Amino acid sequence: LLDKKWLTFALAIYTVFYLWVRWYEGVYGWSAGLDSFAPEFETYWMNFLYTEIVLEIVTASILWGYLWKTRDRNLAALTPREELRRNFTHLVWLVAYAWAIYWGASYFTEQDGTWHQTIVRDTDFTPSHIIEFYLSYPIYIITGFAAFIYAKTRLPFFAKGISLPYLVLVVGPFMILPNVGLNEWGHTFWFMEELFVAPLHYGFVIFGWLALAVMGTLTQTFYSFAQGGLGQSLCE
Amino acid sequence: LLDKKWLTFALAIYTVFYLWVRWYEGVYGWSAGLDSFAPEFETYWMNFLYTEIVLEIVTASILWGYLWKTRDRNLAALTPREELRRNFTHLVWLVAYAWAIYWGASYFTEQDGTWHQTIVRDTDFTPSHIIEFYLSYPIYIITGFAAFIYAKTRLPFFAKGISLPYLVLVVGPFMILPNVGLNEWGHTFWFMEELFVAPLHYGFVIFGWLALAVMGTLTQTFYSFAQGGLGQSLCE
Amino acid sequence: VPGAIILDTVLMLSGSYLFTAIVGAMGWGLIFYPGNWPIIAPLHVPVEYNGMLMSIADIQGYNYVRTGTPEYIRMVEKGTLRTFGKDVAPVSAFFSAFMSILIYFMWHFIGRWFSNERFLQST
Amino acid sequence: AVRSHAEAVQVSRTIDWMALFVVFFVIVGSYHIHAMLTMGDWDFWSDWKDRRLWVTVTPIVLVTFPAAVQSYLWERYRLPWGATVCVLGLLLGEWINRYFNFWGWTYFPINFVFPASLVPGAIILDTVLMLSGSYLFTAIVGAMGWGLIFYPGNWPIIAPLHVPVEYNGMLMSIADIQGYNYVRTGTPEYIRMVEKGTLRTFGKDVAPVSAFFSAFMSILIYFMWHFIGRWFSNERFLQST
Amino acid sequence: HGEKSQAAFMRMRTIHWYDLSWSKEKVKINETVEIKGKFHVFEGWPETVDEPDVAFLNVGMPGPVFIRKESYIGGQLVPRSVRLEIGKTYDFRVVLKARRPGDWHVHTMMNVQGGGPIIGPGKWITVEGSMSEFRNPVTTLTGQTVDLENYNEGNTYFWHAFWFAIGVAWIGYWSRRPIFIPRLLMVDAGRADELVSATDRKVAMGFLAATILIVVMAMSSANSKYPITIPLQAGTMRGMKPLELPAPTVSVKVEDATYRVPGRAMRMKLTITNHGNSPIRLGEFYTASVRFLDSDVYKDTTGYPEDLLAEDGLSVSDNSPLAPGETRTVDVTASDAAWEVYRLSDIIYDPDSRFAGLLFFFDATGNRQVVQIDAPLIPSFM
Amino acid sequence: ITVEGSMSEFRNPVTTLTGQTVDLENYNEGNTYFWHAFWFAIGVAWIGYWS
Amino acid sequence: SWSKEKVKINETVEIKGKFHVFEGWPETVDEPDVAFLNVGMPGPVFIRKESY
Ligand SMILES: CCCCCCCCCCCC(=O)OC[C@H](COP(=O)(O)OCC[N+](C)(C)C)OC(=O)CCCCCCCCCCC
Ligand SMILES: CCCCCCCCCCCC(=O)OC[C@H](COP(=O)(O)OCC[N+](C)(C)C)OC(=O)CCCCCCCCCCC
Ligand SMILES: CCCCCCCCCCCC(=O)OC[C@H](COP(=O)(O)OCC[N+](C)(C)C)OC(=O)CCCCCCCCCCC
Ligand SMILES: CCCCCCCCCCCC(=O)OC[C@H](COP(=O)(O)OCC[N+](C)(C)C)OC(=O)CCCCCCCCCCC
Ligand SMILES: CCCCCCCCCCCC(=O)OC[C@H](COP(=O)(O)OCC[N+](C)(C)C)OC(=O)CCCCCCCCCCC
Ligand SMILES: CCCCCCCCCCCC(=O)OC[C@H](COP(=O)(O)OCC[N+](C)(C)C)OC(=O)CCCCCCCCCCC
Ligand SMILES: CCCCCCCCCCCC(=O)OC[C@H](COP(=O)(O)OCC[N+](C)(C)C)OC(=O)CCCCCCCCCCC
Ligand SMILES: CCCCCCCCCCCC(=O)OC[C@H](COP(=O)(O)OCC[N+](C)(C)C)OC(=O)CCCCCCCCCCC
Ligand SMILES: CCCCCCCCCCCC(=O)OC[C@H](COP(=O)(O)OCC[N+](C)(C)C)OC(=O)CCCCCCCCCCC
Ligand SMILES: CCCCCCCCCCCC(=O)OC[C@H](COP(=O)(O)OCC[N+](C)(C)C)OC(=O)CCCCCCCCCCC
Ligand SMILES: CCCCCCCCCC(=O)OC[C@H](COP(=O)(O)OCC[N+](C)(C)C)OC(=O)CCCCCCCCC
Ligand SMILES: CCCCCCCCCC(=O)OC[C@H](COP(=O)(O)OCC[N+](C)(C)C)OC(=O)CCCCCCCCC
Ligand SMILES: CCCCCCCCCC(=O)OC[C@H](COP(=O)(O)OCC[N+](C)(C)C)OC(=O)CCCCCCCCC
Ligand SMILES: CCCCCCCCCC(=O)OC[C@H](COP(=O)(O)OCC[N+](C)(C)C)OC(=O)CCCCCCCCC
Ligand SMILES: CCCCCC(=O)OC[C@H](COP(=O)(O)OCC[N+](C)(C)C)OC(=O)CCCCC
Ligand SMILES: CCCCCC(=O)OC[C@H](COP(=O)(O)OCC[N+](C)(C)C)OC(=O)CCCCC
Ligand SMILES: [Cu+2]
Ligand SMILES: [Cu+2]
Ligand SMILES: [Cu+2]
Ligand SMILES: [Cu+2]
Ligand SMILES: [Cu+2]
């Protein structure tokens, strides 16, 4: 067994959902999605905002609660094969988290860049703002916290102590979501132009830096792999 | 004995003197105190500045010199009861210092705020500037240095080593007094308006932060109390 | 006081300092304007003052003469060409909550130093 | 543990592939958001790619992530492609977005919205890193290479766009005509921080002086971000966050 | 589509667009649609908005569905930012060439350096055809007619793909050998000094030398081909020619102006004094992209948008012809559904409840005078 | 400029658009005092619970 | 117009004329709101006695 086909599903769910979201915004970006006060815009995009927020809060609660309720209490009694299997499942969680980071912080972020760079901003909940700030950002926040809970509750290495770099990796990209307030406080206030390199955007930049903690995260996961699944073979 | 009625006098002297100062400035704020070049203003407020500066320098010299001359040389031969009595006297000194901090950094500071916010500044030695910068600031500076000298020369804990946090607490609020120069260099220069949140005032803000060292000061004084007057009773 | 109480309760409950900086700081930033709304709500009632629309607070500021504080020093909402809908108060509240998160994180460690009990022997 | 040494090797290969995926795409997200919110405007359009601001700013803000990622990767695994993986990740994200959002969602031409080329700088940074493993020597020489080869690296692509044209009475380059024609509703002409000429611009030196300033500031930013990355490589465990 | 979000008072007093005329309403691919008219920069410019010292005349369309072929302010082409003088009237002429089929809301927007976008009235313009039919030929000074749609695209793709391929080769060279855990363990357990050794250093020298030589050779080739290049043209165009309008012979003083909350009507009182020797009749009130017309005085023939037009939304208490020299006070009521559709009634939410607009007074002979009005706008609740 | 009389005689009536003549000297003072005192009382209770 | 072409030490050479500030001032150059009328010579080989 070891690494199962959970990785394929983990990548495929994100790919399918995000391709559908891209199709949705490419269909309703204009023509019910251009004007923020039209009656059809509330039915096509204000509904997007409400359904996605409710579903994301519910899914975050359910996922974190399940991963915390099913936590392994007897971590001392852990065979090295099962520990290596859990290490691979945690690495699958990290792969899903990285895919979510990409989809949220590159694709939809620059999609919003194109959106507001080629139109005039009409509200705080434009189509691309709904797609990026309130869908993709909460999705990778949920995935990062779920991976944190899984690692802490299953991996003997990551248990008995909260990992500082991996905590930074889970929290910094999370702080981008409350940083959306600075984005809007910036465009409505200090930056009355569609400048996209102005300091109002440095809020995401600072917490875009905090995603560099994946370096410490991955060296820590390698150390976790190198306890039971050390081999050997390596270093001989 | 232990804590005597020196605390009542320590609070009462500040209260009486500062109520009299408030009455004085409420009587002579206007009408000999509005115009800085009238012959009566020099007799009512320039005299305030000279007498208070002379008295403060003399009192600081006398108090620090007495507290340093009467220092206890034989600190090893100190009964725990006498050590606890000295700890209580030092805590009375700290209470007097805190009362002086309040009276200087809140009451008269915002009184000067009202003063220059509701009139036009006429000089560097306005009534409220004389009351705050040159009276209350030197008073709590004197009290803080006196408490420092007392703690260092009497308390076995605070002797044999200059306490870093308590030094910061005594010196930071002291640096507010030389920071008065930035206040005047600010209003005469860079801030030609009565803006009271402008960076010319950040000088007091930085050293207003240094008064947070009372946290380390009070945990250090608790540790000093917990040597001889430890009890016990606590922790049993 | 609402912000203080939120900060303290979210501190003791879930003693995690990071959780406090993340949630209690949101509470502190977000409950400021609703916390003061009962007090300043009566002062925002529209009034026509000799031909110009004014709130009660504007009339007080206009009447009661502040010799040192003219009207132009007032950094207030003057309206923007980027102010979309009715969002000035909530967007400002969320920006304040986020910056409160950052300032809480910085000042937690600044206070951690002020709590020191070191003794420099030769300052 | 594991059954045999061969299974250990196969497991190590699977882990290497998955962790390479994680590194690549976390960098693709974070580095791209950093770049686009620090240099996006000069990177979005072809009439923004001037000779003062574009080449001044782009290397300065784009040596940030490669420095940190190199500081981690070389130190921990002797793998000299941290800068290259960061640069190719940024390029992949930018090109996917240009093709599927700039040209797919909207219809801005690719020859108008093409991104900037950074692989020469990445390769210089990585080779000058592994050769002479001295991190200081890397920050001193590879950063000069990164700053200096930016404009010559992009010159083959933007060279055809600078051909003079007279457009209804006014001289315009091809890039200026593209920016004028293709309407950017949110980006007027005045937001363009480009070379507007100065009374202190002596001779033909706008591009080289800007390139050298960018190389120097790249030295400084590399030095800062090497240590910033040294912290992100930490394996500490705060017991009570 | 960008309006209805900006501050109502800000849309009321920044820039007044009038005499707008669209050449075509149903355009085909490559066919030219031209927008003309006059815009008046308001005297009482809001202080929060930087003065139009550096203003660029733009057009508000979703993406580049129309390419802006030409755009003039005054009589001269203005491809770059221009300086506008507060209080002056300029006329513009934007030439648009259709590119993408569909119904496009083409707005005439104006961008100011530190004040953001001023979207003007927009007209639904339909385009028929296919995008692949679009052709954009431009002739350079070196003697080459190039189509901007595909020019340099191949060279861009080739160079970007070549550099990406070089980077992928550089990464894969190390990806061939085991990558993470073995190398980490070799580095941790004592000196590694075997993970990087010949001929890896020789390959590194090869990559570095190849990169330097490739960049230098490509730069030299791009200097031989395309031997004539110029920098990007930039710089604000000062000295726009403003329209020399005659001084209006009608003076309008606004003695209070109110609007019901909630409502769709604006009540306002004027003291019109007519100078000269002609009888005037108030016919139109343009406040913010919305024209309130008096059907008894003026009927629109310029194809103004239906949602922005009030054919009989302007009602004057005393609209009899006004003899020259005579002054009178009238109650003018501009009531239309647009006042709430375009959220002109959300000026109560704005931090400056003041309005501005243009009043158009027409004579019997047909000629008109454009007079300005600005006054505080006091809401009414009872 | 000399002023005679008493400050308590001063009256500043202003009529709002909602139909309420309010004297600016005392308008909203009671509500301000009540809310500030209530919040201070809540804070004092919170501190005293641990005190 | 230059008063002299071959001057002696202490002797006065005067430069007169008219300068027209261009209407289409480049935007990159700040407007002459604070402009100082100078003279470009290598060091102080001439002292600027007067300038109007
Ligand atoms: C981490 C947790 C994330 C939770 C996020 C939840 C977001 C849900 C989407 C809201 C869209 C909206 O706008 O609202 C709901 C929309 C409104 O569209 P309609 O007008 O009814 O048109 C008819 C719908 N079409 C236009 C899509 C055909 O209709 C719906 O019911 C459809 C929502 C389908 C979502 C599930 C499919 C996702 C792709 C498959 C791989 C997973
Ligand atoms: C992980 C974070 C999840 C947060 C979810 C939000 C729950 C909202 C609770 C009700 C608030 C309310 O009803 O308040 C709404 C008011 C609206 O203001 P108004 O229109 O000016 O006037 C007041 C009008 N009333 C009296 C009718 C309310 O205030 C706000 O602007 C808050 C709403 C914006 C919240 C954006 C959150 C985006 C989260 C993205 C990650 C999923
Ligand atoms: C303890 C430390 C925390 C301090 C932070 C508090 C927030 C500061 C609020 C500024 C209000 C002020 O001071 O004034 C407000 C001034 C007044 O300008 P105006 O005349 O309206 O200009 C008109 C131009 N418009 C129309 C575009 C506004 O607007 C400003 O220029 C805003 C300057 C930006 C300051 C915020 C930077 C936040 C940093 C985020 C990076 C992560
Ligand atoms: C840490 C060390 C702090 C030292 C500070 C010293 C400041 C002294 C005050 C100078 C005032 C001034 O303006 O100068 C001296 C004033 C000038 O007023 P006059 O015109 O003579 O009117 C007659 C005086 N009346 C107007 C006060 C009635 O007259 C004086 O002699 C009176 C000074 C009395 C100070 C002692 C009483 C304090 C309150 C009781 C509790 C302690
Ligand atoms: C020996 C004990 C008694 C003397 C103590 C000192 C009292 C002041 C003497 C003023 C003499 C003079 O010349 O006045 C001061 C002259 C003004 O010029 P003027 O022509 O006098 O204007 C008449 C003005 N009146 C009528 C108000 C007097 O310059 C100044 O504004 C100096 C301003 C300094 C500001 C920064 C001070 C920061 C202190 C930091 C401490 C750590
Ligand atoms: C080693 C590091 C130490 C450096 C500090 C040295 C002091 C700097 C002196 C500035 C002089 C200058 O540079 O120029 C002087 C400029 C010239 O402006 P103006 O044209 O006269 O404007 C006219 C506007 N008025 C009329 C209001 C002046 O006035 C300034 O804007 C002052 C800027 C404030 C700088 C001081 C900040 C101090 C920080 C305090 C926070 C704790
Ligand atoms: C309980 C789950 C479902 C609800 C979830 C919340 C969805 C939004 C509700 C809007 C209610 C409202 O009042 O709208 C929002 C009002 C606007 O005023 P309006 O008059 O409504 O304008 C009509 C505008 N439209 C037509 C587009 C709706 O203010 C705002 O712009 C609030 C802006 C907040 C920006 C910063 C948010 C940062 C979040 C950080 C998270 C960690
Ligand atoms: C720990 C987090 C606790 C959150 C508690 C929220 C209490 C309810 C707030 C109602 C606000 C309101 O009524 O609407 C918004 C109004 C401003 O509206 P305005 O545009 O100025 O209009 C003025 C006219 N009014 C009064 C008729 C509307 O107030 C605010 O500025 C608060 C903005 C932030 C609200 C955040 C709510 C979303 C959930 C946040 C946590 C995920
Ligand atoms: C590790 C360090 C490696 C250095 C590799 C150098 C490759 C060759 C560059 C030729 C540049 C060119 O052709 O001239 C300069 C041009 C700009 O010219 P322009 O004024 O805009 O005119 C445009 C019209 N052209 C194209 C006909 C000229 O390009 C640049 O902006 C690059 C500026 C930095 C060059 C640094 C070279 C000096 C050695 C540096 C190391 C000590
Ligand atoms: C310790 C560091 C030593 C560095 C020595 C420099 C070697 C130059 C290699 C050839 C470059 C070349 O040929 O490039 C020259 C171009 C000129 O640009 P152009 O006139 O605009 O157009 C292009 C015209 N062509 C096509 C004819 C070239 O680019 C430059 O501006 C780079 C030259 C300035 C370098 C200043 C270095 C000062 C070092 C001081 C310490 C000793
Ligand atoms: C839109 C919401 C979708 C939520 C999907 C959650 C799937 C269930 C999570 C989970 O429990 O892990 C699934 C797999 C395999 O790990 P498991 O073995 O199930 O974990 C439990 C370990 N234990 C048996 C020792 C007690 O571990 C993984 O690596 C799962 C990654 C799948 C993709 C995550 C998507 C998250 C989107 C918010
Ligand atoms: C305007 C100037 C007034 C100065 C007042 C100074 C009073 C005398 C200071 C002093 O020595 O301490 C008084 C009390 C009790 O401490 P003592 O026992 O007197 O200290 C000596 C200790 N020793 C016997 C072991 C040698 O210790 C205290 O806690 C005294 C606090 C009283 C208030 C301080 C006011 C300072 C204003 C500048
Ligand atoms: C505004 C910024 C906030 C101020 C906080 C900065 C404090 C810096 C710490 C510090 O002062 O170090 C003291 C050393 C002298 O050491 P020593 O006197 O040898 O003490 C031995 C133990 N110790 C080395 C750990 C101190 O270095 C020295 O040379 C003595 C200088 C002590 C000055 C500290 C007083 C600060 C009051 C403002
Ligand atoms: C934007 C700036 C980048 C953020 C990086 C700052 C990290 C600062 C380091 C830190 O968090 O220190 C943790 C200590 C609590 O210590 P403990 O929980 O006792 O852990 C014992 C071992 N340790 C003392 C070395 C940590 O201090 C605490 O009170 C716990 C707070 C932990 C919060 C760190 C999470 C940062 C996520 C943004
Ligand atoms: C690694 C990120 C891939 C992003 C690809 C993307 O955004 O695809 C949308 C775009 C949409 O253009 P098109 O394929 O022409 O289909 C248009 C359908 N809408 C308008 C809904 C997007 O093209 C595709 O769907 C190609 C499928 C790629 C699979 C990895
Ligand atoms: C904890 C700080 C207390 C500050 C109180 C204060 O400033 O009192 C002055 C003020 C002056 O107003 P009033 O009492 O009317 O007497 C006016 C006398 N002058 C004008 C000299 C202040 O009221 C009192 O004197 C009340 C006594 C409170 C004792 C703690
Ligand atoms: Cu933004
Ligand atoms: Cu001050
Ligand atoms: Cu529109
Ligand atoms: Cu106008
Ligand atoms: Cu001239």
Distance between the termini of chain A: 26 Å
- Domains of chain A (count): 1
User: Biggest β-sheet of chain A, characterized?
Assistant: none
Termini gap of chain E: 33 Å
**Based on CA inertia axes, which overall geometry of chain A fits?**
elongated
Strand coverage percent of chain E: 35-45%
Number of strands of chain E: 21
- Report the β-strand fraction of chain A as a percent range: under 5%
Largest interface between protein chains, with number of residues from each side? D-E, 88 and 96 residues
Helix content of chain E: 10-25%
Form type of chain E: elongated
**Continuous helix count of chain A:** 8
Order of helices and strands of chain A: HHHHEHHHH
Bound molecules: diundecyl phosphatidyl choline, 1,2-didecanoyl-SN-glycero-3-phosphocholine, 1,2-dihexanoyl-sn-glycero-3-phosphocholine, copper (II) ion
Computed Rg of chain E = 30 Å
Radius of gyration of chain A: 20 Å
State the CATH class of chain A: Mainly Alpha
CATH topology of chain A: Glutathione S-transferase Yfyf (Class Pi), Chain A, domain 2
Major beta-sheet overview of chain E = 5 strands, antiparallel
The secondary structure category of chain A is: mainly alpha
InterPro entries (chain E): NH3_CH4_mOase_B, NH3_CH4_mOase_suB_C, NH3_CH4_mOase_suB_hlx_hairpin, NH3_CH4_mOase_suB_N
Subcellular location (chain E): Membrane
Enzyme class (chain E): oxidoreductase
Cofactor (chain E): Cu(2+)
SSE diagram, text form:
The structure is cut from a larger assembly and holds 2 copies of chain A (236 residues), 2 copies of chain C and 3 copies of chain E.
Chain A: H1 6-28, H2 39-69, H3 80-118, H4 127-154, E1 162-163, H5 164-175, H6 180-188, H7 202-209, H8 214-228
Helix pairs in contact in A: 1-3, 2-4, 3-4, 3-8, 4-5, 5-7
Chain C: H1 2-12, H2 17-30, H3 32-40, E1 47-49, E2 52-54, H4 56-63, H5 88-114, E3 119-120
Antiparallel strand pairs in C: 1-2
Chain E: H1 8-12, E1 15-22, E2 26-28, E3 32-41, E4 55-57, E5 66-73, E6 76-77, E7 89-98, E8 102-112, E9 116-128, E10 137-139, E11 145-147, H2 153-175, H3 181-188, H4 200-224, E12 250-260, E13 265-274, E14 280-286, E15 291-293, E16 309-310, E17 314-316, E18 327-335, H5 338-341, E19 354-363, E20 368-376, E21 378-380
Parallel strand pairs in E: 2-9, 12-21, 15-16
Antiparallel strand pairs in E: 1-3, 3-7, 4-8, 5-6, 5-7, 8-9, 10-11, 12-13, 13-18, 14-15, 14-19, 17-18, 19-20
